[model samples]
Target chain A: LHQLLCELEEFGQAAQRMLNITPDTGEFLAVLVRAMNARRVLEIGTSNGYSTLWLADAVSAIDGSVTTVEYAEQKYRLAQKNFSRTSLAHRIDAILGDAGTILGNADDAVYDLIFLDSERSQYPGWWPDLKRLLRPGGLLVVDNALSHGEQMAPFKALVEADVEFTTCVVPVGKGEFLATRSALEHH
Target chain B: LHQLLCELEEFGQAAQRMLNITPDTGEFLAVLVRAMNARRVLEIGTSNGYSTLWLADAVSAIDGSVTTVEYAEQKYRLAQKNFSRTSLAHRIDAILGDAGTILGNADDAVYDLIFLDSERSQYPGWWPDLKRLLRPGGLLVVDNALSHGEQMAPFKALVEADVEFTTCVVPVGKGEFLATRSALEHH
Candidate 1:
């Protein structure tokens, strides 16, 4: 834990550069990781790596790591530069392809936490991947799920239709969808 | 669900009278309730009924009810008035008293969702009781858990303790605490 905390301090500073990319929500994301003591993480979007930096920091906090996906090659390059600034360069692996295609090849339900911050309108399509990749009792923190009013209808429908998952919308970033995979016996 | 939507529509309009409240978030809260299908809810701190009204509408959506405890008698009376304006008045019971005292009388592990929106310094004291009242898989959402900067220390401590909880401090309404009772097997 002490080692992880030290990495968090380093990653926290590196994530500061992401402030100009979008409304920096890395702090909240970092807190999410720290709270979970996450060892394995998966992030679906890598826009300039601001958000991705936090996930790396979180994994480092527990002496774990992350596998973050990025569709845009240019953005992934910048994310690489950001990762190189800290030991997270080794901790994070950037998948350079569409989430739908890349996620299919990955193992199932092994991640401690999965963050969804990709295109908001695609949440319905990404919904299946989230369920597939998140381990039971793992967290799925969906960033921009609320969409700042862009695609509320589809988002609302998808959430309402889900049976095995329970979620809450936190008005953060553009907005966030915090959901968890759970066994019914516990509820 | 339809009736609850109508009440939510009304609540959003009512909230316009307050400068600090956001109507769209009332709808967001409604979605959260439907997502969780939360059957039992306990809200700490009811002020002017702005948010309480929204919560009542969400609870009423699924025939579930909310038991909200308010410290200020004046605020309780206001919340009562707001409840009376809707068909949901029957679903929301406004308790007038100190939360620390009233909470002790609550049965153990009964509520599905607990919302804390009280004094920040008192969070540590209230933590155990909140945890006690929540059923396994129940959610604990505390507002102001991200009070600008003052809350980080306490927030970090609670999250790192490895108790039966996972917390994330969302940046909304002075910051919201979206935490859950960790699954027994996971813990």
Candidate 2:
């Protein structure tokens, strides 16, 4: 998994521009997943599977599973090969679909952690399902909170205004906006 | 600031088992400090002032101050020089004294964030003061929660049982245990 990550990082840097997380955020996510002991995870973007590797590797230790969705068919297919290279392939479920449709179909409060990295313009519309899909105390993490600050304003406002989450933005790689759902149930 | 960190990391790796945070945790701390917009901050351990650099640099951007206590005179003096080499020196107040004494004399609910990285064995005894020192919705971050699991058991249990904190262990550098004080006031 480590070797594959380095290779993808090289590819991301040299060949094409991939909307991937920085090495710092990767470590942060792995640490978070293990620390939370998250059993079920979701990633909205699987761009070449760079971030998913970290999540899958960490969650696999506790027998947890990851369901990552990719919007582009070409990227989705590439991610499959990337996953197949690692022993953790079985731990990840890579899907090819628009994030909204996938999110709409996902069961309520089933995910322990949800990672958002795609569809920045549509996030405000997807806020309802995102909130509904997370269990109480579950974490909802959004990428590019700082690097793409202007694009995330509405989404940030919505999460901050809500009483159900305690939100903060960690200015790491591209910036990570973390919102933990209230343990107390809320409609 | 980044250069100093690299130097300290190298010195830490080559010379002593400095209980310094990993690069990943350093990023996490800086990010968290910035994300929470923490103004009044305190550091219980100032070993070589490594972690203090991250905290001070972050809070300085928001015109905040950091009060860091080091039990050892030698380390405290060294930390002072370390701070002098950086622009963030003015933002940090390095103190030489036992942490308990420092905590005992500290004001209640005055700090926006408190970072505990030393005296793990005595953490349980310091619980009341630690809890008392943080403002409502403030953050209390403990280091070495996973790397030194057995030693932190009692302290972890105490925080977990408290109604005022929502606590979880984050396995970052040495494993950071984060406890966010309840936004709602609690006695």
Candidate 3:
């Protein structure tokens, strides 16, 4: 698995145009999954499946699965191929569709970890769905928060104001807003 | 608690020469503690108690506590004074001592979250102790791993070689090396 991730990292770098996450960010995502013993993972963008591979590797370690969504036909197909090439594919479910629509129908509080790597402008629209899908005590990682700076400000502000979550934007890999859903409150 | 944290953030920033964590990183630390529901936290450096306050704030929310150490007398005194000013002080134990010696004598697998923000050169030597003190599935955050660049290479390499941890250096404030202790394994 490590070898495959290294190769993927190299592949992304060589492509020079793949806007996939940095190797450090991929490693960080995996670490977060392992730390939380996360089983059901979801990623909004599967750019060539580079980041999905990272998520899959981590989830597989804990006998978990990754359900990734990619909208672009080319990238979606590419991700499917990439997943197929790896032994970890059985643990990854690659879907081709609009992330917002897919997440809107997802069962409430089902995902233990959800990675948002889609278009920043669309994040505000996905906020409610993300909050609904993320299980109490689950993690929601929003990438490119700091990279886009002004473009990400609104979404960042939304998370901060929403009482359902405790959010913090780590300046890692274009800045990641690492948020955790507040555990369900029992009256 | 948010009000107190905002005050601490302002204080740290105004201090000019105080090498405390950035506001974003402070919020990040607090968020990690809350997300993990960490009850026991350990911090290696307690400079002016700025970051300690952040950790304490989060732990307090979970009815947890923070045990922080500082070697330099001046900084230790400053941390003590800062802690005294906040109601959260009761949740933090600020110790003035060498981290290596203190951690060596500490109980094993006792901490849920451990933050290292001390001298970079001393980290390699403290590896075993850090690992020992961190419980299975616990999080260990090493601050300045990327910001220090070459200076932090040795410690970063050490984590990679250590099989007990799943590590990733997040390019956040000063680069945080976020690592999780692997769950208990059969020998």
Tens-digit lDDT track for model 1 on A27-103? Answer: 55665565445588898887667677767866765677888888878778877776777667788888888888877
* Model 3: how far residue B33 lies from native, Å: 1.4
Ranking by lDDT: 3, 2, 1
lDDT of 2 by residue, B10-50 (tens): 76521333646777677677656654557889999888898
Give a tens-digit lDDT track for model 2, residues A100-141.
Answer: 999999998999888998979999999999999987767888
Cα lDDT of all candidates, in order? 0.66, 0.81, 0.83
Residue pairs with clashing backbones, model 2: none
Candidate 3 residues A1-187, lDDT tens each? 6665666666553242375787778878888888877889999988788889889988877789999998888888777777778798899888898887898888988898999888889988888888888888788998887778798888889888978778887766777888887765566
- Model 3 sits at an interface RMSD, in angstroms, of 1.5
Model 2 misplaced regions, further than 4 Å: A13-19, A185-187, B1-187
DockQ of each: 0.17, 0.05, 0.64
Top of the candidates by DockQ = 3
Evaluating just chain A, the predictions reach TM-scores of: 0.81, 0.95, 0.93
Chain A TM-score of candidate 2 vs. true chain A: 0.95
- Tens-digit lDDT track of model 3 for B97-120: 988889989999999999999989
Question: Which one wins by DockQ: 1 or 3?
Answer: 3
Candidate 1: the clashing residue pairs are none
True contacts kept of 2: 0.01
